[PDB]
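Practice problem. Given the sequence and the SMILES for VYM, write out the predicted structure.
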Amino acid sequence: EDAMTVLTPLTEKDYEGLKRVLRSLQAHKMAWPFLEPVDPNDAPDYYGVIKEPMDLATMEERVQRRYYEKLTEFVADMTKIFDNCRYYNPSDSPFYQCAEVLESFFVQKLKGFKASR
Ligand SMILES: Nc1ccc2c(c1)N(C(=O)C1CC1)CCC2
Ligand SMILES: [Cl-]
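Answer key:
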Protein backbone atom coordinates (compact mmCIF):
# COMPACT_ATOMS: atom_id res chain seq x y z
CA GLU A 1 0.00 0.00 0.00
CA ASP A 2 1.20 3.48 -0.89
CA ALA A 3 2.08 6.10 1.71
CA MET A 4 -1.12 8.07 1.09
CA THR A 5 -3.24 4.98 1.76
CA VAL A 6 -1.42 4.13 4.97
CA LEU A 7 -1.44 7.42 6.76
CA THR A 8 -3.00 10.37 4.95
CA PRO A 9 -5.92 10.94 7.34
CA LEU A 10 -9.31 10.43 5.80
CA THR A 11 -10.93 13.79 5.10
CA GLU A 12 -14.64 14.48 4.89
CA LYS A 13 -14.31 14.34 1.10
CA ASP A 14 -12.56 10.97 1.43
CA TYR A 15 -15.47 9.78 3.58
CA GLU A 16 -17.98 10.67 0.86
CA GLY A 17 -15.94 8.49 -1.49
CA LEU A 18 -15.86 5.64 1.03
CA LYS A 19 -19.63 5.84 1.32
CA ARG A 20 -19.93 5.52 -2.45
CA VAL A 21 -17.61 2.49 -2.50
CA LEU A 22 -19.51 0.84 0.31
CA ARG A 23 -22.88 1.47 -1.35
CA SER A 24 -21.54 0.00 -4.60
CA LEU A 25 -20.56 -3.18 -2.75
CA GLN A 26 -23.89 -3.35 -0.93
CA ALA A 27 -25.73 -3.06 -4.29
CA HIS A 28 -23.72 -5.76 -6.07
CA LYS A 29 -25.65 -8.88 -6.99
CA MET A 30 -23.05 -11.12 -5.28
CA ALA A 31 -22.97 -9.20 -2.01
CA TRP A 32 -26.00 -10.92 -0.43
CA PRO A 33 -23.94 -13.23 1.87
CA PHE A 34 -21.93 -10.29 3.24
CA LEU A 35 -24.59 -7.63 3.88
CA GLU A 36 -25.16 -8.56 7.53
CA PRO A 37 -23.29 -10.63 10.12
CA VAL A 38 -23.31 -14.35 9.45
CA ASP A 39 -26.38 -15.90 11.07
CA PRO A 40 -25.30 -18.70 13.46
CA ASN A 41 -28.43 -20.58 12.35
CA ASP A 42 -26.92 -20.77 8.85
CA ALA A 43 -23.54 -21.91 10.27
CA PRO A 44 -23.58 -23.11 13.90
CA ASP A 45 -19.79 -23.36 14.29
CA TYR A 46 -18.99 -20.12 12.45
CA TYR A 47 -18.16 -17.97 15.47
CA GLY A 48 -15.87 -20.63 16.93
CA VAL A 49 -13.91 -20.78 13.67
CA ILE A 50 -13.76 -17.11 12.69
CA LYS A 51 -12.26 -15.04 15.44
CA GLU A 52 -12.89 -11.59 13.86
CA PRO A 53 -16.16 -11.62 11.91
CA MET A 54 -16.89 -8.71 9.60
CA ASP A 55 -19.75 -7.70 7.33
CA LEU A 56 -20.88 -4.73 5.26
CA ALA A 57 -23.44 -3.50 7.80
CA THR A 58 -20.79 -3.32 10.50
CA MET A 59 -18.59 -1.41 8.09
CA GLU A 60 -21.50 0.93 7.31
CA GLU A 61 -21.97 1.64 11.01
CA ARG A 62 -18.24 2.31 11.32
CA VAL A 63 -18.31 4.64 8.32
CA GLN A 64 -21.26 6.57 9.76
CA ARG A 65 -19.46 6.85 13.11
CA ARG A 66 -16.22 8.02 11.44
CA TYR A 67 -14.44 5.03 12.94
CA TYR A 68 -11.77 4.86 10.23
CA GLU A 69 -8.83 7.26 10.42
CA LYS A 70 -6.80 5.91 7.48
CA LEU A 71 -7.77 4.17 4.24
CA THR A 72 -5.72 1.13 5.26
CA GLU A 73 -8.15 0.50 8.14
CA PHE A 74 -11.18 0.50 5.85
CA VAL A 75 -9.41 -1.79 3.40
CA ALA A 76 -8.46 -4.09 6.30
CA ASP A 77 -12.10 -4.51 7.38
CA MET A 78 -13.21 -5.17 3.82
CA THR A 79 -10.43 -7.71 3.35
CA LYS A 80 -11.52 -9.47 6.55
CA ILE A 81 -14.91 -10.13 4.96
CA PHE A 82 -13.30 -11.89 2.03
CA ASP A 83 -10.59 -13.67 3.99
CA ASN A 84 -13.10 -15.01 6.52
CA CYS A 85 -15.24 -16.29 3.67
CA ARG A 86 -12.43 -18.04 1.83
CA TYR A 87 -11.17 -19.63 5.05
CA TYR A 88 -14.54 -20.83 6.33
CA ASN A 89 -15.96 -22.06 3.02
CA PRO A 90 -14.55 -24.57 0.53
CA SER A 91 -13.20 -23.32 -2.75
CA ASP A 92 -16.09 -24.88 -4.70
CA SER A 93 -18.84 -23.24 -2.57
CA PRO A 94 -21.08 -20.43 -3.85
CA PHE A 95 -19.93 -18.37 -0.88
CA TYR A 96 -16.32 -18.61 -2.00
CA GLN A 97 -17.33 -17.64 -5.54
CA CYS A 98 -19.13 -14.57 -4.21
CA ALA A 99 -15.98 -13.53 -2.35
CA GLU A 100 -13.81 -13.85 -5.46
CA VAL A 101 -16.23 -11.77 -7.56
CA LEU A 102 -16.87 -9.14 -4.94
CA GLU A 103 -13.24 -8.73 -3.99
CA SER A 104 -12.32 -8.14 -7.64
CA PHE A 105 -15.09 -5.53 -7.80
CA PHE A 106 -13.88 -3.93 -4.58
CA VAL A 107 -10.37 -3.66 -6.02
CA GLN A 108 -11.73 -1.95 -9.15
CA LYS A 109 -13.69 0.52 -7.01
CA LEU A 110 -10.82 1.04 -4.57
CA LYS A 111 -8.43 1.91 -7.40
CA GLY A 112 -10.96 4.46 -8.60
CA PHE A 113 -11.23 5.90 -5.09
CA LYS A 114 -7.46 6.14 -4.68
CA ALA A 115 -7.09 7.92 -8.03
CA SER A 116 -9.80 10.42 -7.02
CA ARG A 117 -8.10 11.43 -3.75
N1 LIG B 1 -25.43 -15.07 4.62
C1 LIG B 1 -24.95 -16.33 4.78
C2 LIG B 1 -25.77 -17.46 4.68
C3 LIG B 1 -25.22 -18.74 4.86
C4 LIG B 1 -23.84 -18.92 5.15
C5 LIG B 1 -22.98 -17.80 5.25
C6 LIG B 1 -23.60 -16.52 5.08
N2 LIG B 1 -21.63 -18.02 5.55
C7 LIG B 1 -20.55 -17.35 5.01
O1 LIG B 1 -19.37 -17.61 5.34
C8 LIG B 1 -20.72 -16.30 3.99
C9 LIG B 1 -20.41 -14.84 4.37
C10 LIG B 1 -19.47 -15.62 3.45
C11 LIG B 1 -21.36 -19.08 6.50
C12 LIG B 1 -21.85 -20.40 5.86
C13 LIG B 1 -23.31 -20.30 5.33
CL1 LIG C 1 -29.35 -4.44 -5.21
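Check your answer against the key. Residues 1-117 form one domain.
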